[PDB]
Amino acid sequence: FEARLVQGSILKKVLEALKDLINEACWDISSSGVNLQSMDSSHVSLVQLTLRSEGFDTYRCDRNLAMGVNLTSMSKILKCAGNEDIITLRAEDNADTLALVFEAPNQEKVSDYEMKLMDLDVEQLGIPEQEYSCVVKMPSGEFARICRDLSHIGDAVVISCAKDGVKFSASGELGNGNIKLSQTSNVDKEEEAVTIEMNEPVQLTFALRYLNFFTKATPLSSTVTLSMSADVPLVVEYKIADMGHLKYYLAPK
Amino acid sequence: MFEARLVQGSILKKVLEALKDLINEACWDISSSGVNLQSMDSSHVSLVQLTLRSEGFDTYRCDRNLAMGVNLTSMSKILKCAGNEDIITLRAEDNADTLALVFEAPNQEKVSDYEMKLMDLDVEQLGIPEQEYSCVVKMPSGEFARICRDLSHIGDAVVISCAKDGVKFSASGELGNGNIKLSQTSNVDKEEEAVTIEMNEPVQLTFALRYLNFFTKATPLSSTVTLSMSADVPLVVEYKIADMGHLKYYLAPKI
Amino acid sequence: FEARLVQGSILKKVLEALKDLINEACWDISSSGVNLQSMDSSHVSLVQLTLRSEGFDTYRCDRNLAMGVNLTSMSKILKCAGNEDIITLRAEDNADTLALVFEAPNQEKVSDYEMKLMDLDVEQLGIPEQEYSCVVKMPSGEFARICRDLSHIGDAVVISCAKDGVKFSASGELGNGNIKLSQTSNVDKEEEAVTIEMNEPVQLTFALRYLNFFTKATPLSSTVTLSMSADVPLVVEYKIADMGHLKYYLAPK
Amino acid sequence: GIQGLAKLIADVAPSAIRENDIKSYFGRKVAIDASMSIYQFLIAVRQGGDVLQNEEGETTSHLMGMFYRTIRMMENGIKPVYVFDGKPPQLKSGELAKRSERRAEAEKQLQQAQAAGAEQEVEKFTKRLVKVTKQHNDECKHLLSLMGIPYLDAPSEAEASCAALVKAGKVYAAATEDMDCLTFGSPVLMRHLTASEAKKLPIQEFHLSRILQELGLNQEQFVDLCILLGSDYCESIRGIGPKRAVDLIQKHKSIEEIVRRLDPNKYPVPENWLHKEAHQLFLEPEVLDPESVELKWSEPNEEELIKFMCGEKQFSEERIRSGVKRLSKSRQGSTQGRLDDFFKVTGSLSSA
DNA sequence: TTATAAAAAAA
DNA sequence: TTTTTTTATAAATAAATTTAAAAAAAATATA
DNA sequence: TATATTTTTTTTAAATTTAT
């Protein structure tokens, strides 16, 4: 296994997105691409990371390798990689070391980094693609401010879906928070416009600590895809630029 | 019945950022002349005489005199939800148990209609006489924040000395003695870096530093600090907002 | 004693470097410079300092006086000075007060600061001036990246010297790490990159808490002159531009 | 000693109690009932049994306790004055005989507890019986004289002299755990002045003006209510507790109208009443003149105080030297004034 | 000088 | 159906000292 | 440079014996 990646900030933001949720997970690396479908340490939220092999630059993979990494530890290893460094993953068959090589853009620093992995139980949940009636395409900064600023009021948000727009409501000791968002149908910039596709209106209640942990992924993309339907887990999808996606799951409160 | 549409909502955000840690529970005195506040510290040292006049508000109306009781930590925690360019609308109704804060961004589409539960607060209002202060020091606000923070690094008391040539900020502590001196900068023309001192009597008073560090969180409101003071008269730290009102901070001297 | 610095941010960065390494120091004020030799709180890392007299604006020294200064207090008093402040170090022969005079670049504010000086005069250990086998004159922020990003994974770096590149090898319990640099003597970039004067190989295990204390002098100099040999403490020069230099010493483990 | 008045203030008007912290009274002159302090330090200061003494057999727990508490209150800016009780009044003698009977039966259980062999009951009933003497108050005033902190001697009641001290404006507030100082006429009453933390003991600041505003009463109305809750100076009704006293004071204003409307078949009226002289003594006790006494917190003496505290008591002289150094350090510091004496209140403002 | 849980008594 | 004596109970502390523990200002990192 | 964001200092409230 060898996966050279000329923009290491994507994998750095992935590991700053998942070190708060998941402590230990099995990286299901295959020939089609890097897949990570794992459930968090508190056993509430499910994270589906898919990094396609077409998005990688020099991707080769012999067999289906499933190594169990420590997310805080290799996140601390990816602290050593800069914003612009070229991350080259490297692995062997008989070895259990995830060899990480960081290369400078001006080719002056080579940072080799091995790992001491341990095995874990390979639990594949596999939530199927339920047809989501209300899909919402939000910007990253707006969803980050909505979750981070309704989280100060209560531990529960109430997301409401409509044709006119999405309504984020939150109650608690701090009065009543209630946020409208008018559906801008491609009139502004497409990275800023909110487009909603509604079949029936969806009114659900979700937690906000797990949604803060989900919206830590907002440096990865400029668009957040919220998919809602009745009594299903909530998809919080972060579409990485032609390099697969990153989907979160949350059961309603 | 009380609708107070304010376009520059960063002013109210910076007011509650200033007022979140000095006083913890304040009673806003809403009249038809404008939103006012007059609340003391819990240790009875500092007084926050805040006014926000009705001329600077974009749409201000109130049918009667109202006095809601607001947890200011809660109002800072709900006013941190608004951004720096939100139009902030204050809404209160008949028998207001709650206050509705509407944050509408102009270029964006977020109609952030928050509400906040009020408090059963009974505080006292104090009549401030319009005294002629002897030494009035108009001087830059970030310079005052630098002076208060960098003399709170030494000790817990600043002995403010005022004269014709300039104001001297002396702070005696366990590390040493830090004598920050200032010069009268009306001869050199600057747009905001001007220490304008109007002195009548040379005053020499000692003030605390925890309360001055609580005062210097009002520095993003304006660049002007009007240090009005006299001999055995409490210090006035006035933050003159250019839009409406002025945030006046009162501080009892040390003996 | 009256040393006036036009660039008082130099002394600000010196005391921000030495605020946490050493606590109480003996400023051996010479007639032609400002000198300091002290060891740390665990007495394992030696700090040498030399601020030359020609870098100051006005310098007088009527008597060779050795002030005893707690550097945490004078670091807190130098935190009051701005980064553009003209700093005058007035002293007295009989009175034990260091009258630090910080002046603004515009003539509107002068801020006088005495401080209380104790008496701590100990036997300084003079290092012998010896030739060094591996002199690595490499940029400072690169060394800050080495110290922080290898203290993330371990508590020891084992630096290897070679002609083509210098290798910082950390082998902590979280995993292995080999950051290897490249030799460039101001070839590509505008300032001086990693220049190695290697004669004999260097294979020494070092410490990272004390290197993390050492790398807080990185706002002073753009480059770090790492000079070391076999079974000797290394020399970490922070050559201040026309004001003097700052040295650091740490014995191998 | 008022039965359940603190529960009545905590149930009726919680706004009258301002639970503050020990450092918040950093400029207030405070009058302390010293007998509560001496009784607090002669009970709590123990090591599994006997009172902490010297080798001469002299009781000296109260001096070391007041030394620690008083220097910890100069550390928090309190300038105290200790008001000592003198000759007790004639109406005090009934509760004094009741307390003497309580100490006599505690002596009886101490007599049958030494033969039992249980060491916990011995120290427990040693805590149950404490009698202060002239010698304890004499060395207490000697330690206060050597600390440079003034003492006042009440002619009749130290709570009455405390309430006369607060009413004359010489001190800010009275400091006793009793509710007697509210009855004798102190507008502000402080409680629980120990040396503890914020979470452990707050300072129960009882404002009498807030009590009279919330209950709709005045000074002679609160005295009759305080009789009806069972003061030590008289005897209350067997059928009237706290809430019934609130309802009957809000029904009948003076206590004579309560006498004018009772039934002896339902409510047992105590014969041979003492309420008239108790009302005339809570309204008008005999006290010292507070305008004729000047209160000075002078510099503490050092060498006579260390030879008094260690030459005959065998104490840790470094702790006494450090305590006198902290008192002299915190005495000469610049006190912070309030805004209550610079700007005056023009009116309150409630919530709407 | 408190403060309790507990309990018969009583409005 | 709460209230009220009426019981026999319990109790009044503060520093020398760690020590685990929770904030609160320092010093990066980042949009 | 705000704006958070973790690290890490800084209290600080616990829980022990001594305060003879």
H or E element at residue C20: none
Tally of structural domains, chain D: 2
Q: B239 φ, ψ to 5°?
A: -105, 95
CA–CA distance, A210 with D18 (Å, rounded to integer): 40
Residue whose pair of structure tokens reads 């409101």 in the numeric block: B221
Same domain, D59 and D185: yes
Do residues D23 and D76 touch, judged by C-beta distance below 8 A? yes
Q: Is D319 helix (H, G, I), strand (E, B) or coil?
A: helix
Do residues C48 and C124 touch, judged by C-beta distance below 8 A? no
First-to-last CA distance in chain A? 41
Residue type, D3: Q
**DSSP conformation letters of A26-95:** EEEE-SSEEEEEEE-TTSS-EEEEEEETTTSSEEE--S-EEEEEEHHHHHHHHTTS-SS-EEEEE--SS-
CA–CA distance, B209 with B73 (Å, rounded to integer): 21
CATH class in words for B1-255: alpha beta
In the structure, how far is the CA atom of residue B93 from the C1' atom of nucleotide G11, in angstroms? 44
Instruction: Give the chain B residue whose CA is nearest to the CA of D345.
Output: B126
- Which domain, by its residues, includes D118? 1-214
CA–CA distance, B89 with B104 (Å, rounded to integer): 8
User: Which residues of chain C make contact with B175, given a CB cutoff of 8 A?
Assistant: 73, 76-77, 115-116
Query: In this structure, how many other beta carbons lie within 10 angstroms of the beta carbon of residue A126?
Result: 8
Do residues A169 and A160 touch, judged by C-beta distance below 8 A? yes
**Domain boundaries, given as residue ranges, for chain A:** 1-253
Same domain, D54 and D179: yes
Burial of D198 (0-12, 13-18, 19+ CB in 10 A): exposed
CA–CA distance, A29 with A61 (Å, rounded to integer): 8
For residue A49, give the nearest of A73, A25, A80 by alpha carbon: A25
First-to-last CA distance in chain C? 40
For residue D224, give the nearest of D209, D237, D214 by alpha carbon: D237
Tell me which DSSP letter residue B128 carries: P
Tell me which DSSP letter residue B54 carries: T
CA–CA distance, D118 with D97 (Å, rounded to integer): 29
The distance of A180 to chain B (nearest Cα, Å) reads: 5
Record: contact B78-A179, CB cut-off 8 A: no
Q: What residues form DSSP beta bridges with C45? A: C250
For residue C174, give the nearest of C149, C195, C144, C199 by alpha carbon: C149
Burial of D73 (0-12, 13-18, 19+ CB in 10 A): buried
CA–CA distance, C114 with C97 (Å, rounded to integer): 6
Query: In this structure, how many other beta carbons lie within 10 angstroms of the beta carbon of residue B74?
Result: 22
CA–CA distance, C218 with A140 (Å, rounded to integer): 35
Torsional sign, CA B57, B62, B64, B67 = negative
Same domain, D162 and D13: yes
- Number of A/C CB contacts below 8 angstroms equals 62
Fold exhibited by the domain C1-253? Proliferating Cell Nuclear Antigen (3.70.10)
For residue B4, give the nearest of B47, B66, B49 by alpha carbon: B66
**DSSP conformation letters of C33-71:** EEEEEEE-TTS-EEEEEEEEGGGSSSEE-SS--EEEEEH
Do residues A215 and A147 touch, judged by C-beta distance below 8 A? yes
The CA-based dihedral angle spanning residues D22, D24, D30, D34, taken in that order and rounded to the nearest 10 degrees: -10
- Quick one: which residue's CA is nearest to F4's C1'? D241
Burial of C127 (0-12, 13-18, 19+ CB in 10 A): middle
Distance, CA of A17 to chain centre: 6
In the structure, how far is the CA atom of residue C149 from the C1' atom of nucleotide F21, in angstroms? 30
Residue whose pair of structure tokens reads 């980064």 in the numeric block: C83
Residue whose pair of structure tokens reads 């002045």 in the numeric block: D193
Do residues B165 and B180 touch, judged by C-beta distance below 8 A? no
The verdict on whether residue D271 carries a ligand-binding annotation is no
In the structure, how far is the CA atom of residue D268 from the C1' atom of nucleotide F2, in angstroms? 20
Q: What residues form DSSP beta bridges with B198? A: B136
CA–CA distance, C179 with C164 (Å, rounded to integer): 13
Residue whose pair of structure tokens reads 């060899």 in the numeric block: A99
Establish if D250 belongs to a structural domain: yes
CA–CA distance, A72 with C146 (Å, rounded to integer): 20
Same domain, D153 and D122: yes
Residue type, D37: S
> Experimental technique used?
cryo-EM
Q: What residues form DSSP beta bridges with C113? A: B178, C100
Same domain, D98 and D210: yes
Q: Which residue, of D259, D284, D309, is where some domain finishes?
A: D284
User: Which residues of chain D make contact with B119, given a CB cutoff of 8 A?
Assistant: 351
Interface with chain B: mutation pick from A152, A164, A174, highest number of B CBs within 10 Å: A174
Resolution in A: 3.5
Residue type, D105: E
CA–CA distance, D342 with B252 (Å, rounded to integer): 8
Chain D touches chain B, with at least 3 Cβ pairs below 8 Å, answer yes
CA–CA distance, D62 with A244 (Å, rounded to integer): 77
**DSSP conformation letters of C144-190:** HHHHHHHHTT-S-EEEE--SS--EEEE--TT--EEEEE---SSSSSS
